[PDB]
């Protein structure tokens, strides 16, 4: 992906505890991932 080419890439502003990274990704819901930050079950882009 370091040299992969894309179209229409946008950044996101969200602050998480850090212990629920797997929870932010779809398939898991938590105290902050359940409500505050949600990702679709088919979500492009990675977690940084």
């Amino acid at each position: 992906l370091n040299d992969l080419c894309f179209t229409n890439v946008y950044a996101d502003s969200f602050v998480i505890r850090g212990d629920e990274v797997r929870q932010i990704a779809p398939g898991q819901t938590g105290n902050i991932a359940d409500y505050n930050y949600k990702l679709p079950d088919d979500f492009t882009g990675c977690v940084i």
Partner: nanobody
Amino acid sequence: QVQLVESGGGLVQPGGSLTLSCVASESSLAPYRVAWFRQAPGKEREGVSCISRDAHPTSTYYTASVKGRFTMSRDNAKNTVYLQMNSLKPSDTAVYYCATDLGGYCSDSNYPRAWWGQGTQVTVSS
């Protein structure tokens, strides 16, 4: 609208074990957090523990007086939450109540307090 039934309390010796059950009927506790409270006569109701709808250790909360001794678990199929006391102390002798609301996740400071059961008496003595 939900009613709760506490049971399992009784006369136990110091250092003993017990298992309380907070039976929920007419409503489902699966999407809602559940909290445990105890109140011996003389003192105001105090929190014991609070389990969330996900039943996760992160969402699993215990009060200081019960850390490392009291454990809870829930089975939403039967619509009841357990509370397992280990090494019961005489200070734990109180009327244990379970409280729940429409909220789903507990916090270190927020426990459901909407609907309460009749309560069960846990006595830790000879």
